[PDB]
Amino acid sequence: SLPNGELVLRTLAMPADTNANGDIFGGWLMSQMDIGGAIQAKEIAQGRVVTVRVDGMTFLKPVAVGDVVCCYARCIKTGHSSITINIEVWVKKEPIGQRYRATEAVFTYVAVDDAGK
Amino acid sequence: SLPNGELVLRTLAMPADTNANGDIFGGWLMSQMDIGGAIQAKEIAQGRVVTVRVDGMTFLKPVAVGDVVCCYARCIKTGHSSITINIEVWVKKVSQRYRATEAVFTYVAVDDAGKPRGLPS
Amino acid sequence: LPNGELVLRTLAMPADTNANGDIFGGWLMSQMDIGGAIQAKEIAQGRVVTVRVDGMTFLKPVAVGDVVCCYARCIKTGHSSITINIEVWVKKVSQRYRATEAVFTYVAVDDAGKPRGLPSG
Amino acid sequence: LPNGELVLRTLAMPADTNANGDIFGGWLMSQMDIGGAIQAKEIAQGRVVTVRVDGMTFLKPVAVGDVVCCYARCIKTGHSSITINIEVWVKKVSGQRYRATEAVFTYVAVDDAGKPRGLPSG
Amino acid sequence: LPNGELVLRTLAMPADTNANGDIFGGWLMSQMDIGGAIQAKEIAQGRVVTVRVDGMTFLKPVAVGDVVCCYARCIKTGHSSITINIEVWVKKQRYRATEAVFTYVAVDDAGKPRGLPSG
Amino acid sequence: LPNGELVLRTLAMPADTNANGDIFGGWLMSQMDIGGAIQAKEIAQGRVVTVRVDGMTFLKPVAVGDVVCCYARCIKTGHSSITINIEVWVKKVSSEPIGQRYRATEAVFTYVAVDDAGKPRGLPS
């Protein structure tokens, strides 16, 4: 019941976002996080942004299909161009209603205008 | 700033979901609603649920690309197997909060053979 | 037997399913919307918009690999508004049975997304 | 004029575009495969698998927002091999009619193990 | 063993299957369309458009979790029509699962035919 | 020409695009996790799981219609733990500035050979 930051994305793990095994593909997790961080940055940049680096990504617990994947983003650095955002991914519900932290990572964004600088 | 029901789904409107004018085709909207509602319905029924009825759907305001679409569901009725849930579709960043869709989705708790089952209280 | 125009003849794909094995009725409603938007665009001979969906019922489940057919009939031809009755009949690939019924409402819109009058044909 | 029976009828969504904005042209092949597979599964009175595509012609291109109608007509059958000519016609709703595709699709009826199986004449 | 240059190496995804569970052959042909259009755009040095597919053969089935390799080899040097021979080899032991002969046409920005330099 | 093994090779598609027209990051990462996962399953002869992603830098943007290539190189083997350096290069620049191949992303990925119960397992050496 207690995630840090603001919930930016809350979706359902579709079976299309899997691997050969059937598991939720981590790649795809990383895509979900890139999107959510770009969201908070776009709130911050007051516009369109562009990602340049990602540090310290950790995949804590696996994700299954049919679980709700909640993304919680919280900004970290009062940087001029280096919009740094801390992103974690929590999964819900096998006993239904089970919350656990599934990803920890530190995203670094850079605000780009119609001409990024 | 409190939504009456729970935010069950929050995604970004991607251009994959467009029409010829440029708004999001509300196929995609109804799918979002049905899934988002199914989540909380599944919270209640403690098993599989099935959409059985969808009434009074209104597309209040249009949806654009690159915007955040938020779905808020609040249950109203629990009958025999029926979980009735009122669903709202809000957009978060115009590019401002407005309700863009409202509807009443009605679900039914089922077994593996698609037939009714009681609601676990 | 089906009344109206066959607007769509499509197959139930796995990509469109849930965990159960049946098609998520997200997908069905998407199909019915496409099917309505087509006839509406014929009537308005231009762009339309889904604005209202009433009395949708998911009668019978639909499996994967079956043919999904939508049958549409206009009922009301308002000033800009086109009302269309849509039904989904499934043919069995791998027998017709109607699995869903709904009443879609579209609106004749122009190129700038604003309502417009209805032609005569 | 439209020779064959309508197996598939759908609308072109933008979800399926290329770089300029046209319909991705393998996707048509995806449709032809499904639609032909339909009449094949009709005849084989069971399941089939695609094995050959001969002489496919892209007569006229297709854009987004048009209705695509697929017509399957059988020509030849083997013990297991089903030959079907497919025509793809466009209505251009967003109502001019014209043929968009011609091809000869060949399928094979397989049993539970994946080997070909027999066909009753009727 | 495989003939030509590898334009695509993609993984068979679940969403790409048919009802039985095999890889959808629609999808295979979809991948081949791309594999051919790549080499067609490289040869033509601009836009191309698919206009014909000859002798497409599905040799062996594919399941999910295999590596799909697309091999294109140009075969005929004409004025307008660019014919490209395409094979698909699957990994998991590599084996050729598909063969076909694609025919493309060089186009301008207006989807109209255009000249070929050193076709 | 680049190092490692080509594990993934795809075309930059639309619908994976942003407002500007270049493909946004994270499809790129989807491809890197995939591309690495291939070679890891080949090497461990069984199931693996991404556990860590190190030092990712977005060097150059990628437009739509360009060829996206993954080259993976294993570097480290633990008892079960596999560290692999993954490279993403673009083969073709749209239609015309053809043959200008350039690396667009690189990172150091960490996967782990696990069983069906997701538990680590020894590595086939």
Which CATH number covers residue B57? 3.10.129.10
Measured between CB atoms, does F81 come within 8 Å of chain B?
no
DSSP run (H or E) holding B90: strand B82-91
Q: N- to C-terminal Cα distance for chain C?
A: 27
Only one residue has tokens 């603001």, namely A6
Search chain D and give the residue with CA nearest C31.
Answer: D10
Chain E neighbors of F94, CB-CB under 8 A = none
C1 three-class SS = coil
Q: Which DSSP letter does residue D41 get? A: H
Question: Two tokens at A10?
Answer: 């809350």
Spatial separation of the C-alpha atoms in residues A80 and E59, rounded to whole Å: 58
Listed residue (A101, A30, A12, A35) closest to A62, CA to CA: A101
Listed residue (D32, F16, D30, D11) closest to E30, CA to CA: D30
Spatial separation of the C-alpha atoms in residues F66 and B34, rounded to whole Å: 36
Listed residue (F61, C64, D60, D85) closest to A51, CA to CA: F61
Which stretches of chain C are DSSP H helices?
25-44
Q: Which DSSP letter does residue C118 get? A: -
Spatial separation of the C-alpha atoms in residues E116 and E31, rounded to whole Å: 25
B110 three-class SS = strand
Instruction: Compute φ and ψ for E77, nearest 5 degrees.
Output: -110, 95
Q: Which DSSP letter does residue F114 get? A: B
Search chain F and give the residue with CA nearest E33.
Answer: F11
A6 three-class SS = strand
Question: Two tokens at A3?
Answer: 């995630």
Q: Is A101 left (phi over 0), alpha (psi -120 to 50) or beta?
A: beta
Question: Two tokens at A112?
Answer: 């780009």
Spatial separation of the C-alpha atoms in residues C34 and E8, rounded to whole Å: 33
- Identify each DSSP E strand in C24-96 by its residue range: 48-58, 67-77, 81-91
Chain D neighbors of E107, CB-CB under 8 A = none
Measured between CB atoms, does D41 come within 8 Å of chain E?
no
Residues A46 and A54 sit within 8 Å (Cβ to Cβ): no
Spatial separation of the C-alpha atoms in residues E88 and E33, rounded to whole Å: 12
Measured between CB atoms, does E21 come within 8 Å of chain A?
no
Resolution of the structure, angstroms: 2.7
Handedness of CA F99, F105, F111, F117 (dihedral sign): negative
Q: Which chains touch F (3 or more CB pairs under 8 A)?
A: A, B, D, E
Question: Two tokens at B37?
Answer: 């509602």
Spatial separation of the C-alpha atoms in residues D38 and A91, rounded to whole Å: 40
Burial class (CB in 10 A: 0-12, 13-18, 19+), A2: exposed
Measured between CB atoms, does D9 come within 8 Å of chain C?
yes
Q: N- to C-terminal Cα distance for chain D?
A: 29
Q: Are strands A68-77 and A6-12 parallel, antiparallel or unpaired?
A: antiparallel
Spatial separation of the C-alpha atoms in residues A25 and F36, rounded to whole Å: 12
- Identify each DSSP E strand in E1-119 by its residue range: 5-11, 48-58, 67-77, 81-91, 94-106
Spatial separation of the C-alpha atoms in residues E51 and E46, rounded to whole Å: 16
Spatial separation of the C-alpha atoms in residues C30 and C32, rounded to whole Å: 6
- Identify each DSSP E strand in A6-117 by its residue range: 6-12, 49-59, 68-77, 82-91, 100-111
Search chain C and give the residue with CA nearest D34.
Answer: C11
Spatial separation of the C-alpha atoms in residues E72 and D86, rounded to whole Å: 26
Chain C neighbors of A16, CB-CB under 8 A = 15
Instruction: Compute φ and ψ for E54, nearest 5 degrees.
Output: -115, 145
Instruction: Provide the number of CB pairs (under 8 Å) joining chain D to chain F.
Output: 7
Spatial separation of the C-alpha atoms in residues A26 and A17, rounded to whole Å: 9
Listed residue (E71, E80, E64, E34) closest to D29, CA to CA: E34
CA-to-CA separations, D29 to C9, D35, D52, D91, E58, in angstroms, rounded: 16, 10, 12, 18, 14
Spatial separation of the C-alpha atoms in residues A34 and F29, rounded to whole Å: 9
Question: Two tokens at F31?
Answer: 């491809």
Chain D neighbors of E22, CB-CB under 8 A = 49
Listed residue (D88, D85, D113) closest to D99, CA to CA: D88
Q: N- to C-terminal Cα distance for chain A?
A: 40
CA angle C72, C78, C79 (to 5 degrees): 130
- Please name the method used to determine this structure: X-ray
Burial class (CB in 10 A: 0-12, 13-18, 19+), B106: buried
Residues E68 and E88 sit within 8 Å (Cβ to Cβ): yes
Spatial separation of the C-alpha atoms in residues D28 and B102, rounded to whole Å: 36
Find the Cα–Cα–Cα–Cα dihedral E16, E19, E25, E30, rounded to 10°: -40
Cα of F67 to nearest chain A Cα, Å: 19
Range of the domain at F105: 1-125
Question: Two tokens at B113?
Answer: 């053979």
Domain count, chain B: 1
Residues F93 and F66 sit within 8 Å (Cβ to Cβ): yes
Residue in D27, D50, D54 nearest the CB of E54? D54
Q: Which DSSP letter does residue F64 get? A: T
C89 three-class SS = strand
Handedness of CA C58, B22, B58, B102 (dihedral sign): positive
Spatial separation of the C-alpha atoms in residues D72 and D50, rounded to whole Å: 14
Spatial separation of the C-alpha atoms in residues B19 and C47, rounded to whole Å: 10
CA-to-CA separations, C53 to B103, C30, D21, E11, in angstroms, rounded: 9, 12, 30, 40
Q: For the stretch B10-47, what's the b/e string if a residue is b when 16 or more beta carbons lie within 10 angstroms of its beta carbon? A: bbbbbbbbbbeeebbbbbbbbbbbbbbbbbbbbbbbee
Q: What's the full length of chain A, in residues?
A: 117
CA-to-CA separations, B91 to A5, B68, B74, B94, in angstroms, rounded: 20, 5, 18, 7
Spatial separation of the C-alpha atoms in residues C120 and A94, rounded to whole Å: 59
Chain B neighbors of F18, CB-CB under 8 A = 66
Spatial separation of the C-alpha atoms in residues F76 and F110, rounded to whole Å: 9
Question: Two tokens at D99?
Answer: 């043929």
- The residues near A117 (Cβ < 8 Å, ≥ 6 apart) are none
CB contact under 8 A, D18 and F15: no
CA-to-CA separations, D83 to C113, D50, D54, D79, D99, in angstroms, rounded: 47, 10, 10, 11, 20
Measured between CB atoms, does E65 come within 8 Å of chain A?
yes
Measured between CB atoms, does F20 come within 8 Å of chain B?
no
D111-120: long-range contacts (C-beta < 8 A, 24 or more apart)? D114/D49, D114/E61, D116/D79, D116/D80, D116/D81, D117/D46, D117/D80, D118/D79, D118/D80, D119/D43, D119/D44, D119/D77, D119/D79, D119/D80, D120/D45
Residue type, B62: P
Spatial separation of the C-alpha atoms in residues E113 and E105, rounded to whole Å: 7
Chain C neighbors of A15, CB-CB under 8 A = 17, 19
Chain E neighbors of D61, CB-CB under 8 A = 49, 111
